[PDB]
Motif scaffolding. Structure first.
Motif, mmCIF file in Angstrom:
data_model
loop_
_atom_site.group_PDB
_atom_site.id
_atom_site.type_symbol
_atom_site.label_atom_id
_atom_site.label_comp_id
_atom_site.label_asym_id
_atom_site.label_seq_id
_atom_site.Cartn_x
_atom_site.Cartn_y
_atom_site.Cartn_z
ATOM 1 N N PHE A 35 1.051 -2.496 4.855
ATOM 2 C CA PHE A 35 1.724 -1.214 4.966
ATOM 3 C C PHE A 35 2.921 -1.394 5.899
ATOM 4 C CE2 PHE A 35 2.680 3.080 6.143
ATOM 5 C CZ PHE A 35 2.117 3.924 5.189
ATOM 6 N N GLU A 87 0.764 -1.234 0.000
ATOM 7 C CA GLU A 87 0.000 0.000 0.000
ATOM 8 C C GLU A 87 0.810 1.309 0.000
ATOM 9 O OE1 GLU A 87 -1.960 -1.874 3.309
ATOM 10 O OE2 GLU A 87 -3.931 -1.551 2.421
ATOM 11 N N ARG A 132 -2.548 -5.743 0.353
ATOM 12 C CA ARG A 132 -2.949 -4.842 1.431
ATOM 13 C C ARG A 132 -2.087 -4.902 2.686
ATOM 14 N NH1 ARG A 132 -9.257 -6.312 1.738
ATOM 15 N NH2 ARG A 132 -9.303 -4.606 3.294
ATOM 16 N N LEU A 164 -4.537 1.197 -5.723
ATOM 17 C CA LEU A 164 -4.846 -0.018 -4.975
ATOM 18 C C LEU A 164 -6.291 -0.011 -4.475
ATOM 19 C CD1 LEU A 164 -2.530 -1.812 -2.507
ATOM 20 C CD2 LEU A 164 -4.967 -1.506 -1.980
#
Ligand SMILES: [Cl-]
Lengths: 279, 287, 284, 291
Positions: free
Chosen positions: D230, D193, D228, D284
């Motif tokens: 981070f 992400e 997904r 995204l």
């Protein structure tokens, strides 16, 4: 009015307030001139006076004058739009101060060149924001206007240090950023300013220090210089050379804080078009 | 200091000052708790028992309390520790946030502009104050914002700054939109994708501003940057929401980055997509 | 009759019978006005419209569009005073509208759907009843609808039909939109460009439904077609709309925010309304 | 179709065509599993799910991202009328276009006479470089052998069989060799992400050295690899992606992938367009919501 009365209202307008941009003084003078009398009969009567105000080589007097004229359009509405223009250009410095003083980290060491009414306003905004910072300023030959700048800063109780013009490359390493004003901002986003600016910009880029320009929109001038020679002589004047200004290319500038907003050199052309075609 | 004390201390910080942000009141309480934790001993246990309290404070569903709390513990790496030096340095800086944002943003409120805002926001309030102090002339429309009506409280606060203001129904937002020049809104939290979690009713105000090209501005402190990346409403933790002939009452909704124009922070103006880089720098601060 | 009686008659039409639309209640008091009114000529035509405005008590747009349509189609002619028989006719016809509509709609409400609605609407209630009792299982979401909380009222009415229903805050429309399949709403008025005037809050619901691609359907009687052509909230007459506070009772929803309208005249896309409206106002 | 079947079908797909992305091979067998599944709607769901994870027996992020995205795009008497398979094949048809879109977008940035540096074996980088010979561009490659499977060597032959000059160098000589390169082009097992990427261990090192000499660092990757996550540091990459992949003394360190932060990447070339790391979060969302 006439020549005697123009080179007056103007030249004294600046005396009553030496803090006033050379350009504003002139625009102030025109607006006054329109407040005279006895259609396009007058439109030529005005143009004939900007050139008259060629009693000051300043790029700004030239470009601001042009912009003031273009903004206008019995001849009441012209003295009105002109007032709406003056009232507007005199808000630029506050705007530039608000926008720019924010980019000054607390504890920063700032490098500047010569004297700039706008830069000063920016630093004042910074102390008013409780920021603690130091300043280095070139003495700036041949008028030593940098010493003047240092004095003004000293009165705002800002630790400032004057260095020789020849010492910029040397002092650069101990600065966090460079902030200078401008005489004019050209179409490519580069600037025309007091001789020495260019070297400071070149030196800042070499050490990767951000180089900021603060200037009012009325200094936007219609020129696209490729080098020092494309700068008109009228704006700068085999044994001695004495140019007052030099050109600093857009590649050497990080951002320009203007009343139109914070801009990258390349974004200038778009703003300059919206400005000149105002209405 | 024990659990009883914490909850009391935290509550009396906001007590002695309602204008204080929850995350700041919570961060100060960690600073006291830290100090009053000499009974501890190992540099590890300070850092450990300190996590135990964040949760305690967690008794304030607010997002900022989590992120502020987390960021606090992070900005701090024998028995004799200089952590407290950092904890006060940290407190010293988030206390400048709200004001940096106010003098960063007010400059963008043009004369004669009509501003549309939602419910009550301490940051939005400081911003407008700076605008009248800057001698700017504007007017405001604010949703009464059900169910607690904070919008009405916001309106009165503004009325006391002599700012012309009109309260309107949460349902009249799409209606009133055509007479607004821009929208300014605060935030309970700023998500990794630049989107925001705020008082229920924010999402639709944003969608509406979008359909009329009205710029939509978020003004919020950096300690509100939180480690979440929601794709829609359901992805918002209930801890913060309180939800998803029955009734639903979520207290906050989610606004996507595609619906935000700019975020005004103590880290400067940001576009939603640039938030992720700043959140990284912000969380890896110590380095 | 006289002003007094007029309003008293009108108010006591919807009070003992809320089931009834204000517009319909207005023409009824108008039939009686006419009937109960004897002794003329143009006096009749003028004394009748000079009191139709009086029924403005209901800032409702329908009272205005209804009154005109009714008036226009009985004026075609004390023997001429048989306009009354046309009035009974007209009142007899418009009392079939709800039904033609609930019929034109049983197809769009699919088994298992989740409908999002706004405030109270008699026509909406009808459509859903004609769908539930018609062997269909769905659930509904409706805004409580400040300031008179008519949304809760709607909810209760839906509960009485044992349809699963959840009430949300007006502020939660963009929040709940992702879990809706379609939204059905009634209209206080259908304007000449296919757009609609409806209970404040209707507009933002449409903007959200469109951003999430959810079809927006309006269900309303043709006697609600009014001769107005607004392009924004500002164009809607104050007469229908009502530290400062603004309390607009209705808002306008442009035609581009509407998918289809279900009327006793047939299912229409917003761009067809104008031609229908005229082909309606101009009927012998 | 039971687990043993899935796995064999999945490995067949890869043996059938070795140039096929691991994720592509995976959604294909998920599609086949969905076609045979003789089990109501709810079942079908956790069924086509409690197998996707079974396909997770190839600890690649892509297989995970691809599957997730497939279930997402595919998801929504009623039973049989499952128009899922139709959507399924459509999804399958678009992701197979991606690799070529990247080839076209990227080769444009390879200046004639340029020396490009790569790491390990990457199918998409291979396609990008073929798109380069086709554009009549002349270049030369340097590639790390890449321990422990030496996949870099296999990459060198592929290039040799395409007639592009290629030199193999030790993973330890990247900093040393950086000097001779004009730019770095590397693939990705996953795009996170924040714009960063998860890829063959050794990638981070190359990017850090690239940045130090201001060498552009380009990433080429299909969008079904948008995952997904981070990450803030290496410890943030889940272990199921870095281990079992493809006392006092410890070799206890055999991670298969590493993380390269967004500040070390210049551009990501995707079927979705040429994106800078910050722009990834918006693409995204659009990717994962589009449906
Ligand atoms: Cl000034």
């Amino acid at each position: 009015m006439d020549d005697k009365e123009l080179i007056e209202y103007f030249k004294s307008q600046m005396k009553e307030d030496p803090d006033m941009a050379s350009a504003v003084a002139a625009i102030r003078t025109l607006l006054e001139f329109l407040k005279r009398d006895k259609q396009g009969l007058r439109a030529n009567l005005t143009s004939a006076i900007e050139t008259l105000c060629g009693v000051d080589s300043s790029v700004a007097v030239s470009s601001g004058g042009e912009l003031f004229l273009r903004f206008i359009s019995c001849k009441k509405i012209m003295i009105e739009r002109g007032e709406l223009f003056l009232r507007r250009i005199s808000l630029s410095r506050n705007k530039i101060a608000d926008l720019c003083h924010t980019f000054i980290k607390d504890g920063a060491t700032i490098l500047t060149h010569a004297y700039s009414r706008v830069v000063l306003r920016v630093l004042e905004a910074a102390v008013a924001a409780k920021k603690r910072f130091s300043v280095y300023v070139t003495e700036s030959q041949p008028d030593l206007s940098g010493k003047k700048m240092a004095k003004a800063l000293c009165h705002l109780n800002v630790p400032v240090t004057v260095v020789l013009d020849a010492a910029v490359g040397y002092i650069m390493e101990k600065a966090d950023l460079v902030i200078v004003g401008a005489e004019g901002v050209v179409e490519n986003g580069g600037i025309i300013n007091k001789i020495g600016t260019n070297q400071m910009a070149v030196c800042a880029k070499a050490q990767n220090k951000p180089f900021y320009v603060v200037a009012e929109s009325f200094k936007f001038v219609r020129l696209f210089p490729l080098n020092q020679q494309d700068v008109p002589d009228k704006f700068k004047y085999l044994k001695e050379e004495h140019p007052w200004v030099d050109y600093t290319a857009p590649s050497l500038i990080t951002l320009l804080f203007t009343d139109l907003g914070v801009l990258t050199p390349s974004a200038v052309s778009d703003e300059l078009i919206k400005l000149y075609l105002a209405a």
